[PDB]
Amino acid sequence: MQKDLHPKAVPCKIIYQGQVVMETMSTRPEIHVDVWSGVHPFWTGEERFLDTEGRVDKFNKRFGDSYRRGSKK
RNA sequence: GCGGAUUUAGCUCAGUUGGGAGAGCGCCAGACUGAAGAUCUGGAGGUCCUGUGUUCGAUCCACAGAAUUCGCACCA
RNA sequence: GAGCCGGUAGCGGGCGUGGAUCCCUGGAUGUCCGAAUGGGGGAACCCGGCCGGCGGGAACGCCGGUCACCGCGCUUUUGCGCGGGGGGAACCUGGGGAACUGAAACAUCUCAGUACCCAGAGGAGAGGAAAGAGAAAUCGACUCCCUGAGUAGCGGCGAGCGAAAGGGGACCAGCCUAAACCGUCCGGCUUGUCCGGGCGGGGUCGUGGGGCCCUCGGACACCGAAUCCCCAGCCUAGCCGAAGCUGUUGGGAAGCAGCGCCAGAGAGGGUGAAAGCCCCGUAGGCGAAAGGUGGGGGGAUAGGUGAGGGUACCCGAGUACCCCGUGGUUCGUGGAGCCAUGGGGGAAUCUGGGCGGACCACCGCCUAAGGCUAAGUACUCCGGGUGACCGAUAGCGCACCAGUACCGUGAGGGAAAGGUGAAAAGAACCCCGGGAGGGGAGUGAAAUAGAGCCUGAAACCGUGGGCUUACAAGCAGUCACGGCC
RNA sequence: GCGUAGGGAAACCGAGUCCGAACAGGGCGCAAAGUCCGCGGCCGUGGACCCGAAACCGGGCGAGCUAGCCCUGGCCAGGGUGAAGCUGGGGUGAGACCCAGUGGAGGCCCGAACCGGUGGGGGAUGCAAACCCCUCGGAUGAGCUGGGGCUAGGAGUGAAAAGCUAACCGAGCCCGGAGAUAGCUGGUUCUCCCCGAAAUGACUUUAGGGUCAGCCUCAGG
RNA sequence: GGGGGAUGACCCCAGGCGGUAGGGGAGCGUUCCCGAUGCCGAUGAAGGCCGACCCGCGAGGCGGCUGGAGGUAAGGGAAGUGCGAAUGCCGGCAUGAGUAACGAUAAAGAGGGUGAGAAUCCCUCUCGCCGUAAGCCCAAGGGUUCCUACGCAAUGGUCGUCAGCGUAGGGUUAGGCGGGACCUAAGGUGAAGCCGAAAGGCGUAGCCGAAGGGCAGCCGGUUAAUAUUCCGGCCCUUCCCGC
RNA sequence: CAAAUCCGCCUCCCAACAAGCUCUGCGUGGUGGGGAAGCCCGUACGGGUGACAACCCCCCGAAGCCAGGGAGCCAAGAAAAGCCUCUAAGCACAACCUGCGGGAACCCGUACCGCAAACCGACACAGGUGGGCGGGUGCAAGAGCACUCAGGCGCGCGGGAG
RNA sequence: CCGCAGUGAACAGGCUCUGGCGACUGUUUACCAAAAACACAGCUCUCUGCGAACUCGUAAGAGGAGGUAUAGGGAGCGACGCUUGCCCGGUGCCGGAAGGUCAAGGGGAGGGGUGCAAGCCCCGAACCGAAGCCCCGGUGAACGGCGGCCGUAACUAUAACGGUCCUAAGGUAGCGAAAUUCCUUGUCGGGUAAGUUCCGACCUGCACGAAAAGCGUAACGACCGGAGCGCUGUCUCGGCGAGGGACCCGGUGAAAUUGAACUGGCCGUGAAGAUGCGGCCUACCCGUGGCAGGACGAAAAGACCCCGUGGAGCUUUACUGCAGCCUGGUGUUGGCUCUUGGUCGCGGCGCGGCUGGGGGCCUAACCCUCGGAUGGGGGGACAGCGCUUGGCGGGCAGUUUGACUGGGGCG
RNA sequence: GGGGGCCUGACUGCGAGGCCUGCAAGCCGAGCAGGGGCGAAAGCCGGGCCUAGUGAACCGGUGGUCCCGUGUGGAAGGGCC
């Protein structure tokens, strides 16, 4: 576990898949894709209880970063 | 067939003040030539896509069609 | 309760009712590997500090004990004292997660959220007091069984997939904390009124909590534990335990005959061939302990909450809600919601804020954005019970020097093979022979029951006999007539 | 929960109803009434009459096979050919440049071990799942090699034919999906009674399948 | 089908009856559960072995021989049920067949000896084949296979008194040889550090890692086997205490 | 070359066949062997063990012995014990070098096979498997060749016709 | 001096004449094929300025390379010599980006539902808006392609010339019946007793050709083909022999296939190639050493075939989709200034809110940087990187690509 | 079949009862009602002289309904034409 936020999780899942609409606005739709991928934020440098730096991403990051709910800066 | 682009001389096209129908050609003719060509002169060139309407007056403004063209829409 | 030094029957020697073998439970040793963890490493091996005797050190110096890995709290000081990790057939939730095949192709779909891998909890986890369900102003935890229903419904509307409230049933069951309001302080900024963290207030079940003013009011309300012995159940052995003998065919009787008894225990099994009464430590039925684990149930522990109005009000979360992109749901892009979220905007603290399936008015429900919660269902490694369940090519493949022999470098595969008898009384001795094996004697009911020695069939190889066979065709053969036996 | 009416997309009506504005038809009324169970011939889901393949998909398993690549040693008996050079001499200014000596390179030649394996011979239930015989190429080099290791099996490696990857890789092998599907193929058991078939027609990514008909059989009228 | 059936059965005649897929009816044995007011057997359960009574039949009964202990159901129920037959599975057993093979055309033969028995063993004497091997040696691999006394049942593609076969006993000793108690490259690990959905990936220093580096001896003797270790003669090294 | 005396770099003097320190010959201390014996003894599974031995000269001469050589060349040839410099630091009448004398020295490996019936090929299978001189005579040379030295063996089925 | 012989035995090239391809030593398909196949030294286009570009990788990271344009990767040929010509209409690509188009998106006319009403949800469109594609050009050691017929001196035949229709031009130099030439054993020549192989020459080249080079080329090859001398049982039949099985002895003692069988020829037959069925003719019972014909002999449920709306591998303008790559808006991506466009309001200009484009050092993220420390340095709002957009996209993944068919196909 | 007169039934609601037929289709048709046109009227008209000018059901558009409308008031949306 080394790709999340610290101040909460947000990684994983992701069942994408494209098609060729054309519905309600007349006739019916169609299907295709069948893949799976990722989806997340980014991480910055901080620190806690003797150095540590942290990581976690935006959102959250905007938070605790501002504040700090287990270790500040 | 969903939308946009337009509609003037034989061809290709300008045309915005709502009042002159215009240009180029090209085409025809005259001049010149031994002739034709090139140049100069000149002339013609008409369903301003059709109809109806608005207006003192319509290529121009308003109302359908049409046609051409480009893109798009496609599970009867 | 009186025999034993395990399966070894054999030699050689020995303990024992001034309670041996063994059955129990709690012990002390537990060499080396293995999470290994002192250090290294091709496991089961080889290497280091501290203490240690001091030890042969015959007039000369060693094993033993020990000890210490690393991630976890945090009495922080120089950090001293607690937990973890490795397993584990099956079953559990999360994390991740697929083709075949059906659709008589195949891209949607299906198999499925299945198979597998991963992590991790437990003895059970899962889940669990509702921003729930639905609409009779009706219901209320979660779970599980039946039912709802193969219905409402999803869909190249094709193959298929296929809910739920309500009713019946098992069980019942409820609680907390931030939740800055109050006061306590401790530490900061730097003295005020800021954030901070330990103490209580409250610490919300179905709307309340505080803070103020007057009524208060002045003892039976135990949970998931906490506790005491209680029946602590079991834990292996606990032990009594009804009642026949003669005669007899028998190698053997418990059979055939005669009389005789039992009895809540004629369950079966062992007994030389079929017993209620011979053995059975069985069902009859009562029995039983000083240690290891419960409910029931008794008590205090009891932890713990438990009434009245009023007031302008401040107090369960960082993201609800909305846009796009996926999930789960019966919903496969759909008129398509709720809950869950990948990115971006980023509200309110009770006339607040989601909800009852686009939305809107009105009505009705609920009060989130933290947490704990035994019991009712699942699963057999283990122990027992029972069988219209099997008998050695069936059953687990493996009924007992098998997951071993054996092929595979490996992962892995993975067999075959049980039976004499009543018990050995298991064949002393004599014979041919190098022996094995064969001839007698002896056990004996029988050894053509004789040592892989019960039954021991066929196929197939022999030894004798009857008939038959040399100018003759067809697997076969079957009908006629003849001779030998 | 099936029967107790049903008719209709529905509202809803109802022994009547839907189309409709018309007494013209469709569904039904007319009770004939089941229902549970048992035992059977069948039909769907099922691995489901029984074994049969090539393949796809998951997790492991291997370079003591072989192709490579890294590290580190060992190894090539003899002989032959004779370039750079350096020494000396050679007509010119020095030289180019010539010659003679020395000299000893080259994936160089002739050949053992060693590496190979065309060209013929044997062998074909061999000595052997590639070997024996005669013969041949390479023979200080993109040389042969031991020991230590690295990569890996939809991916590796490959002086590259789809080769080699533990003796058949056109995508390894074991366990798992799983007893995959399998109009095709076989296989498909004791007696006896009764009757007695088709090998056409219609539509099919259907033609050596199968739907519906046609020809069989049993129960009642 | 029909004429009367008492339950059978009997009579007429009509009237056929060859039949695979396949349709309907009726019966047979197979191992089990009843013991529907059921039990046989040591003078044989059952299976086996053999047969000129009962049935259309698939089976019955019954009698003779075998063999050591069971099980039968007069009737209804249940099912892992009837087999040549699947190049089927498993086991045995015949074929070809007393022919094909003895694993290199580097050959033997003779005398004696032992033994129950020797072309195939032991001694001995001729003879043939090596000789770059069919040499001793170090390794790697395999692990008692090595020696000695007994023995041959099977393995030895024949024998076999022989064995690298059986049982028993015994054999291999090192301050200086090799491995460690020293060193690192590849590579592998790997506190810190760096990134994964989880398992994990990488990876500094340090460590693991070898016939590469390094390190202190040699020749003779001595048993059935060992030997640079055992003998002895000769040559050394590191640590420690003392001065 | 993170810190000074080390080595690296510049300057002046001794800048040799000088002196330095690590392998072969003599040898030789002194030991062994030593074959042909060999009286006791197997005079034979012969040899275990006692004469004396002799122990000498010339000849050939390495593809890796001194040695980290020298010469040439290009594709231009691995990292940690020892030796000297020293901080921390303690010795500095007790730290390291040396000398003599006494004391200490482990863990696990060896048999025999080993161009192989004992190793891989399932078998006593004319298949493969890495290093060391490989004895001589002859052939221009040479681990090629023919015979043989030491040592090994006759293939593990023998006769008999042709 | 001697014998037939004097490396006496033993180990030890046959040579030559010619042609074709590839230069050459090589390397490779272990158990058929060592070759004209790859490899190459050598050439040419060519992507790339680093933190490269491409290859593995889920993000780290390694590789690259402690390389740095005399370099690193992509490539078609493959000494050397001589020489590589003609066409960019389509295609890939490089450049262009003014114009059309067009996604998400901004951004408002307007309509709609409920609404007593403020409101409260959608549909929404004029215009601005990305790569891509369309359109202009450049592009050949980039893919690829590089004309047809009629007439004419030609006493006879293209041709020196001429006439044309289409195309982007319309084969050039060298070569030629080559291993690209089926009419063909083409026609001439040489080689021979004749020669459909060769080798030379013509050349109407069924279909060579310069870059998967083209003509040739010393040496070079276990390559392939053509010829001459030498020599031998290869052959004119061979005929003899030596050693090894086979045969007789003793010892041992398998193996696939097979329903079963005492299995004769005939001529006929049957499902049309019979020992077994019909007629007939020869016909005693068994064996061993042999010889192959028949028993449709053995091996293996044909690989050639078709059929199952079976399977598996490679291919492109097959279908779809993903990996990666380009790409608009959005985010942790902060300041300062220079500016033009739209718009509605009050061709215009003045203003105004609105909002769009863009140019700048900075710079506090971010990243990188390092160069000896945490500071400096460089870049910097990038970008990495997250989310949605769109696009290319056979690199890969999964399916598919009918029936008839008097054999499958083509038709 | 050739002209001219007005006229459109080139109809809705239906159709007794048959052809061909495994399926679905395909095809015919008096007569009944509402409402016309042509004729004085008896009658003919529900396109053509015919037999070819073709297509399932779903996947959707649209003009009509005012049948459903997922708490009731409605609308998205759906059923029927």
Side-chain angles (χ1 to χ4, degrees):
Chain A
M1 220 164 69
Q2 308 157 316
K3 292 150 291 190
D4 276 22
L5 54 192
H6 306 73
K8 279 295 188 163
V10 167
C12 284
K13 265 190 185 178
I14 276 301
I15 314 48
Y16 293 70
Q17 302 183 21
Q19 330 74 27
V20 166
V21 160
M22 305 269 194
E23 308 179 3
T24 67
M25 272 291 178
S26 32
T27 98
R28 286 180 142 146
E30 36 215 337
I31 338 313
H32 285 53
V33 186
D34 298 55
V35 188
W36 318 53
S37 67
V39 128
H40 320 81
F42 172 67
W43 45 52
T44 73
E46 346 70 28
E47 309 163 45
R48 174 229 307 100
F49 329 128
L50 264 188
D51 43 305
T52 78
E53 316 212 50
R55 335 205 67 171
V56 176
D57 250 0
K58 183 179 302 176
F59 334 80
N60 309 345
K61 322 207 154 297
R62 334 160 180 200
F63 270 69
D65 37 31
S66 301
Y67 313 77
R68 332 83 157 205
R69 300 160 172 176
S71 297
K72 297 167 199 163
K73 151 99 268 183

